[PDB]
Design a protein around this ligand. Structure first.
Ligand SMILES: *[C@@H]1O[C@H](CO)[C@@H](O[C@@H]2O[C@H](CO)[C@@H](O)[C@H](O)[C@H]2NC(C)=O)[C@H](O)[C@H]1NC(C)=O
Ligand SMILES: *[C@@H]1O[C@H](CO)[C@@H](O[C@@H]2O[C@H](CO)[C@@H](O)[C@H](O)[C@H]2NC(C)=O)[C@H](O)[C@H]1NC(C)=O
Ligand SMILES: *[C@@H]1O[C@H](CO)[C@@H](O)[C@H](O)[C@H]1NC(C)=O
Ligand SMILES: *[C@@H]1O[C@H](CO)[C@@H](O)[C@H](O)[C@H]1NC(C)=O
Ligand SMILES: *[C@@H]1O[C@H](CO)[C@@H](O)[C@H](O)[C@H]1NC(C)=O
Lengths: 128, 229, 104, 96, 103
């Protein structure tokens, strides 16, 4: 089956860029029905969608994260990475990388967020 | 001394002796005897698989894989199934009977190949340390002929079974398509892409009836004929 | 954005009774609703995808039913193993809004 | 809202295995099983078959009564394992 | 009145036949030293053992050749007819209700 694994810094100093990567095992990133997406959950609140990337060079982010978000995808390594430009104390959260399945045909049919990954905790503070 | 007749032989090996349990003994060590063919050694004792020159021989236990006319990667409940669009929305389901028939056929094919191994106890020597002449040449020739013939047999058998398995897996889909077409006598039209356009209002109950093989076409006939023509 | 709201919160029930969770949408969707379960400290697991479609491996206690702007997840029997958070997902449009979880 | 659409289909998998048929030499299928065993445990299992280990002792040496072969007297077996370190430590002999 | 040919189906059939021929033609094994097959004197047990081994090998390989040729010919004929049936059915599906199939 398809599994996803997350890797990146656990602590980011304020006013700096946060970088995360998700690697895929058991499948190929270059399939037309894979929309690799990033989700995040602040402690004690609801879960929030960040954006998705596709192998056709098409990306789509949440309007709330207006301009400080970017997504990249490497097919030769089967990875996709997320970068968050300007960081405040409201970005302390558990981040997940998930895979969406939107299949085509005469009758398009979506399945939701099928495969999830073990979330990584990102804490934003000035400490060392 | 006493001379008996039985199932005893000799072997040359440099491997340790363990406390495990296995019915096939090879100079490289004991090997499982579930698969029909082996690539470890030509010297065997017990119920051992046949030696072949090949290293990989794959038998197809599934249908053809067509990723993104195409396959559905999200259908995790069966092999063949339906996807429908109607006034109440979109949905998907799987057909259990066809999936079970294909699985049963593949399992029946597998049961005749895995676990059926013959027992050979005492045979001729297959490794020589000196050069002697005619008899040693004859033994080498016999062993080489046997190995070549069995390798050819293994390759041909794998090709034949794979061909027939793929044929049956496609035939199941064709059978389901034709059954669904016959159920919808004149109320549906084929579109040529594996889809049927049904010219009357269909709820989830009607699609369930089609999937249920309890679909009466006489009630939905006047409306379908009015819309189709 | 189609906001999703959950009616019950911090629900407590016995072992062998019936529970219901309701998800309502601000805007109208059509059968596009998934039900997910999250145990504390672990990743969510998908339970229902087409809002009336259980996945293999899901115990028979869970069921889902609804349409339009009203969806429900019903559990006829509550085993002690099923004490986690449950939330609903919409995938009609791309912003992919969730709903605040319901604690059991 | 006066017409429905019903499509038939099959299932795919993310990864896949390439197999050979009579007509096609490269056809990708969902699942396949290997029919050739290419691995061994590295040890000779001794439970079902009676196994006699001969170290420093060839079978003919055991039969003749080599000084190092005194432990093989009146012994039975189903498979005699001869080692590469086997040697003789008695009068030289030559079986025709 | 007119007549024309279809390229896709022709090329598919040609490709399948060429693949079969590539699997068959050109693949050979190397044999250097073997046993003697012709004798000038009569000796006994070893000589007719050699003769028996060679005869068994020849008979088995002849059987294999005959069966393989029959199998491949059967499947080639089947695929060549299946291409015509595929073209017929695709043309039938293209004309939904505007054409009727004379037998
Ligand atoms: C197993 O032991 C054999 C015997 O020492 C090794 O030698 C191979 O034996 C096979 C089977 O007869 C032959 O096809 C190869 O040509 C032999 N190779 C060599 C280099 O002698 C063999 O390598 C050992 N291991 C395995 C995994 O088979
Ligand atoms: C086979 O003979 C060897 C060589 O003699 C034995 O190994 C050791 O031999 C030395 C003398 O070279 C003795 O001092 C040791 O006591 C021997 N080791 C032992 C007895 O464990 C070897 O034991 C003999 N037997 C086998 C089965 O290899
Ligand atoms: C797919 O399976 C093959 C073996 O059949 C394996 O070598 C390959 O790594 C797999 N692809 C992945 C994990 O992306
Ligand atoms: C499907 O068929 C079964 C068996 O006859 C029947 O019990 C059930 O009510 C049917 N369902 C529908 C929706 O027709
Ligand atoms: C592939 O087939 C084998 C043999 O039938 C089976 O044991 C295995 O579970 C299958 N793999 C799947 C279904 O992923």
């Amino acid at each position: 089956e398809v599994q996803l694994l997350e890797s990146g810094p656990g602590l980011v100093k304020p006013s700096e860029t946060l970088s995360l990567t998700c690697s895929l095992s058991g499948g190929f990133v270059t399939r037309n029905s894979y929309y690799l997406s990033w989700v995040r959950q602040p402690p004690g609140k609801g879960m929030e969608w960040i954006g998705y990337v596709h192998h056709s060079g098409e990306t789509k982010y949440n309007p709330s994260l207006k301009s400080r978000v970017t997504m990249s995808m490497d097919a030769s390594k089967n990875q996709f990475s997320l970068r968050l430009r300007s960081v405040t104390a409201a970005d302390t959260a558990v981040y997940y990388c998930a895979r969406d399945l939107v299949e085509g045909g005469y009758i398009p049919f979506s399945y939701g967020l099928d495969v999830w990954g073990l979330g990584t905790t990102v804490t934003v503070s000035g400490a060392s | 001394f006493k001379i008996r007749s039985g199932k005893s032989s000799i072997m040359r090996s440099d491997a340790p002796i363990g406390k495990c349990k296995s019915e096939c003994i090879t100079p490289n060590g004991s090997i499982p005897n579930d698969k029909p063919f082996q690539n470890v050694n030509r010297i065997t004792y017990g119920a051992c698989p046949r030696y072949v020159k090949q290293s990989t021989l794959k038998l197809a236990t599934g249908m053809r894989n067509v990723p993104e006319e195409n396959g559905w990667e999200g259908m995790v409940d069966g092999w063949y199934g339906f996807r429908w669009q109607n006034s109440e929305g979109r949905g998907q389901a799987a057909d259990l009977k066809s999936t079970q028939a294909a699985i049963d056929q593949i399992n029946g094919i597998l049961n005749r190949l895995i676990g059926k191994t013959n027992e050979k106890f005492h045979q001729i020597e297959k490794e020589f340390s000196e050069v002697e002449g005619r008899v040693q040449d004859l033994e080498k020739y016999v062993e080489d002929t046997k190995i070549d013939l069995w390798s050819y047999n293994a390759e041909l058998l794998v090709a034949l079974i794979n061909q027939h398995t793929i044929d049956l897996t496609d035939s199941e889909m064709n059978k389901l398509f034709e059954k669904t077409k016959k159920q919808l006598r004149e109320n549906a039209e084929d579109m040529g892409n594996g889809c049927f356009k049904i010219y009357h209002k269909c709820d989830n109950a009607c699609i369930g009836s089609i999937r249920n093989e309890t679909y009466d076409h006489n009630v939905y006939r006047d409306e379908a004929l009015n819309n189709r023509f | 954005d189609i906001q999703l709201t959950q009616s019950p919160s911090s629900l407590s029930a016995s072992v062998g009774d019936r529970v219901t969770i309701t998800c309502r949408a601000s805007q109208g969707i059509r059968n596009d609703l998934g039900w997910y379960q999250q145990k504390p400290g672990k990743a969510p697991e998908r339970l229902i995808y087409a809002a009336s479609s259980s996945l293999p491996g899901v115990p028979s206690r869970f069921r889902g039913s609804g349409s339009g702007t009203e969806f429900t997840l019903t559990i006829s029997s509550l085993q002690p193993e099923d004490s986690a958070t449950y939330f609903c997902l919409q995938y009609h449009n791309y912003p992919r809004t969730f709903g605040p979880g319901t604690k059991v | 809202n006066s017409t429905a659409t019903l499509c038939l289909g099959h299932h795919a998998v993310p990864n896949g295995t390439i197999v050979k048929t009579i007509t096609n030499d490269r056809i990708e299928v969902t699942n396949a099983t290997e029919l050739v065993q290419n691995s061994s445990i590295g040890e000779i299992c001794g439970s079902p078959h009676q196994i006699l280990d001969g170290g420093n002792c060839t079978l003919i040496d055991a039969l003749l009564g080599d000084p190092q072969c005194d432990g093989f007297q009146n012994k039975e077996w189903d498979l005699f394992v001869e080692r590469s370190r086997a040697n003789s430590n008695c009068y030289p002999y030559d079986v025709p």
